[PDB]
């Protein structure tokens, strides 16, 4: 049954292996004859599946790598906390948050870079930060620096503990294979233990520490006069004065009359007027409910006892109209190969990150976060980029599994075979829908441009000539506006202010949130989003499905997952491996994410953000020209790229010069990438031949003969440089513009 | 003087630029308290700017019409230190590096597998070779005269 199984000292810690490189693979271990050897030593460093074949060693290596990664993350967190404690102006920002810019980095005075120490405010000079850490610390209840120092020390200690644990589990006591394959216990502990207890404990902290300190802060008291958090725990009088319910203690909870706790566990919803964030009582209530739900749901699978459920029984016994026998051999597939689990987890994490970004810009969960425009922009863009990258990687790992871990003899699955047997219909229909969507979505813009250039503004697809309104979205907005009165009797207001109707919420003369209207431009942009998403899905799905074999190459599995081509014959067979399909899909993911972030930035700068006056009128940043100027490509090039780049390029001689320097550097790297993307290997090898002759003429030729990069390495270098250049350009442009004008 | 240029200790645009920079710094200096650390930093910056301008004036450079110094790589005797004096120095150092590297390669050509010595450097032999480059011109000239510089 379920038990702990370990092996004692599988490997011995010794420096002998460090002396010689490439010990994992024999062909690497032989010795270097050409430079290519070096480039291989890094390519197969983490290819644990190809070093050996036993599952036990792979699992142990995976565990140790996870521990190392956790240690690195803890070290990074400790460094951030120590920087916040030592070189920062947190205490100044605490008293006057609206007129002080956060900053936690100070530049030395070595060469002339001291001009980077801009005057953020509050008697401090330093680089303004846009990580949103200050809002997190304020919402946590931290009001000093000693607490931050203690947190940093604890983080360092935790990093050391994680490193020791990784070493101990790889070199002293290594879990056996049967320990890993016990997924029922893993799921039970991950649901009930990690997600339930953690959120319950955080709810306890929020109820006991964050709520009273934040109440005192919002009441207008000076930060240096607020009582320390432990005084609230020790003294019941202070809590009773702040909340009378605590005077009754824990008696009501055991008596099931929970309404007595309605003082600090509410259901109002909406945004708090003082700070423009969600009510902390609602957040604590939500955390408590989530804890209860997760603790309940973590006791579903049978482990070592009579009660519970079996995953294999659930999968096998499920009979449906469309599936049939269906899920039969999926349990072995998902418990035998690591790559399938990696693919599913990567897809789920990417989707979760994107949803996180959307929900976080929609409803600000931290105090004084909505009015900080740079923080919002940075958080949204960063999280969406991360989600896109993870979603892309999922397909690559699925292709790896399909290539090297799929055999129909020992493990057979009906649904997978049924999907494989009719791939042509899937690909054909996906291709047709992609063509149709792209044709319509881009033809609308081209038609708008052409009718504009000919002096025919009455034949456009616009808000005045021919209208295409998103009626369904408007209906949903109206239903959500009307919901709190009838559909949600408990909720006092709307879940978020984004839905049409309601009132503007502004903090300190700056607009925090107001309803976002939808028109023709939103229709067109959403259809463009759908088109790009569909094309990326088509590329990745084709790469995954046609990995094992194709009509052109009937034996593509033998060649492997990473092979440049098959030869000049058959008319040319370049880029048929699934790796090349991933390399092609990266560009389209980049395109889609760039378009989406551009849309979000322009819409927010045009129709939401701005300034409010004493009289009551609202003046937006760009004057609300998105509704009429974004229906043509000329409008996107002139009113958005040309107009908003003034702050980036005219930042020389000021405290934002680094942004312009990075703006130029990203352009240089993007132009550099085309050198690898466009050319071929033979020319470079033939040039290196003459260079090597010139070297040998002077008796300075090396023993490791130079060799041009392989084809796959060239493509990888090209795509890496391209992505880095584009992302850095967008980063510099966004940050400079939103810091200057926001 | 040369090519219609003005000496840098006589031009006016130099002084105007210096005044502009000093005023720009002093505008930010006023914001903080006079005794605070940012005030000390800004005072240090002002002192550095003044010293740099005085040194540039005293070094005998030539500002142009718009007010910036111009370098002369022509070969005039009044600008020995503008291009020619540094450049020779560079060559010396550069030659050093090259010479040292070449020597090390030969020092590992005898063994059967020099690749192991290329990817994993040894420190003793490299340290022996490093200081032989201090006299690289003499050894290079002697080798060129002897004829051992070029393979056959």
């Amino acid at each position: 049954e379920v038990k702990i199984l370990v092996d004692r000292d599988p490997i011995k810690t010794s420096f002998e292996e460090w002396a010689k490189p490439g010990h994992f693979s024999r062909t690497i271990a032989k010795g270097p004859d050409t430079t290519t050897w070096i480039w291989n030593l890094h390519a197969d460093a983490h290819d644990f599946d190809s070093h050996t074949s036993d599952l036990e060693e792979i699992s142990r290596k995976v565990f140790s790598a996870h521990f190392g990664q956790l240690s690195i993350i803890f070290l990074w967190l400790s460094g951030m906390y120590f920087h916040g404690a030592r070189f920062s102006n947190y205490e100044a920002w605490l008293s006057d948050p609206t007129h002080i810019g956060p900053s936690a980095q100070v530049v030395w005075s070595i060469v002339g870079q001291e001009i980077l120490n801009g005057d953020v405010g509050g008697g401090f000079r330093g680089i303004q930060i846009t990580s949103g850490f200050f809002q997190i610390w304020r919402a946590s209840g931290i009001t000093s620096e000693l607490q931050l120092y203690c947190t940093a020390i604890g983080g360092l200690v935790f990093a050391a503990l994680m490193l020791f644990a990784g070493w101990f589990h790889y070199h002293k006591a290594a879990p056996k294979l049967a320990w890993f394959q016990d997924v029922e216990s893993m799921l039970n502990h991950h649901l009930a233990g990690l997600l339930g207890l953690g959120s319950l404990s955080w709810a306890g902290h929020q109820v006991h520490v964050s709520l009273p300190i934040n109440q005192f802060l919002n009441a207008g008291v000076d930060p240096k006069e607020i009582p320390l958090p432990h005084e609230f725990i020790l003294n019941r009088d202070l809590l009773a004065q702040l909340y009378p319910s605590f005077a009754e203690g824990a008696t009501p909870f055991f008596t099931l009359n929970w309404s007595k706790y309605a003082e600090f566990l509410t259901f109002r919803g909406g945004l708090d007027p003082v700070t423009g964030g969600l009510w902390l009582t609602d957040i604590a209530h939500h955390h408590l409910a989530i804890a209860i739900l997760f603790l309940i749901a973590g006791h579903m699978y049978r482990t070592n006892w009579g009660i519970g459920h079996g995953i294999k029984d659930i999968l096998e016994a499920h009979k449906g109209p469309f599936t049939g026998q269906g899920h039969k051999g999926l349990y072995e597939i998902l418990t035998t190969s690591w790559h399938a689990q990696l693919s599913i987890n990567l897809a789920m994490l990417g989707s979760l990150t994107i949803v996180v970004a959307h929900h976080m810009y929609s409803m600000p969960p931290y105090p004084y976060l909505a009015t900080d425009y740079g923080t919002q922009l940075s958080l949204f863009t960063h999280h969406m980029w991360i989600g896109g990258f993870l979603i892309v990687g999922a397909a690559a790992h699925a292709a790896i599994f399909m290539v090297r871990d799929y055999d129909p003899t020992t493990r057979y699955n009906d649904l997978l075979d049924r999907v494989l047997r009719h791939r042509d219909a899937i690909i054909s229909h996906l291709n047709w829908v992609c063509i149709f969507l792209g044709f319509h979505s881009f033809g609308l813009y081209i038609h708008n441009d052409t009718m504009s250039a000919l002096g025919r503004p009455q034949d456009m697809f616009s808000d005045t000539a021919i209208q295409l309104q998103p009626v369904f979205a408007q209906w949903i907005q109206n239903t959500h506006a009307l919901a709190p009165g009838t559909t949600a009797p408990g909720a006092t207001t709307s879940t978020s202010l984004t839905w049409g109707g309601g009132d503007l919420v502004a903090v300190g003369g700056k607009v925090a949130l107001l309803p976002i209207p939808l028109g023709t431009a939103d229709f067109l942009v959403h259809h463009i989003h759908a088109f790009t998403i569909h094309v990326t899905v088509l590329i990745l799905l084709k790469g995954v499905l046609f990995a094992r074999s194709s009509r052109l190459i009937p034996d593509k599995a033998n060649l492997g997952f990473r092979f440049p081509c098959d030869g000049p014959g058959r008319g040319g067979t370049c880029q048929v491996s699934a790796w090349d399909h991933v390399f092609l899909g990266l560009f389209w993911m980049y395109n889609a994410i760039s378009v989406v972030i551009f849309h979000f930035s322009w819409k927010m700068q045009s129709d939401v953000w701005g300034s409010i006056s004493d009289q009551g009128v609202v003046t937006h940043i760009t004057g609300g020209n998105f509704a009429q100027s974004s229906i043509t490509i000329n409008g996107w090039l002139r009113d958005f790229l040309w107009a908003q780049a003034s702050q980036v390029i005219q930042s020389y001689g000021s405290s934002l010069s680094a942004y312009g320097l990075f703006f130029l550097g990203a352009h240089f790297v993007w132009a550099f990438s085309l050198m690898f993307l466009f050319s071929g290997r033979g020319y470079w090898q033939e040039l290196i031949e003459s260079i090597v002759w010139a070297h040998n003429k002077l008796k300075v030729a090396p023993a490791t003969q130079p060799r041009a990069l392989s084809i796959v390495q060239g493509r990888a270098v090209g795509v890496t440089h391209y992505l880095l250049g584009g992302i850095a350009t967008t980063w510099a442009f966004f940050l400079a513009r939103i810091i200057a004008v926001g | 003087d040369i090519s219609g240029l003005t000496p840098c200790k006589d031009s006016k645009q130099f002084a105007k630029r210096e005044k502009q920079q000093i005023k720009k710094l002093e505008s930010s200096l006023k914001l903080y308290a006079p005794e605070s650390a940012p005030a000390l930093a800004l005072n240090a910056q002002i002192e550095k700017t003044k010293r740099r301008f005085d040194n540039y004036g005293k070094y005998g450079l030539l500002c142009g019409s718009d007010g910036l110094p111009h370098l002369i790589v022509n070969g005039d005797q009044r600008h020995w230190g503008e291009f020619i004096t540094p450049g020779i120095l560079f060559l010396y150092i550069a030659g050093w590096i090259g010479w040292v590297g070449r020597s090390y390669l030969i020092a590992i050509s005898g063994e059967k597998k020099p690749a192991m010595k290329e990817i994993i450097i040894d420190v003793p032999l490299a340290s022996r070779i490093i200081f032989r480059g201090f006299i690289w011109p003499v050894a290079a000239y002697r080798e060129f005269l002897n004829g051992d510089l070029i393979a056959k």
């Binding site: 102006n89 100044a92 100070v106 530049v107 008697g123 330093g126 | 940012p38």
Partner: peptide, 11 residues
């Protein structure tokens, strides 16, 4: 806040 900035310019 001044001391934190001065920590960089101690030398």
């Amino acid at each position: 806040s001044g001391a934190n900035f001065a920590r960089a310019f101690t030398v």
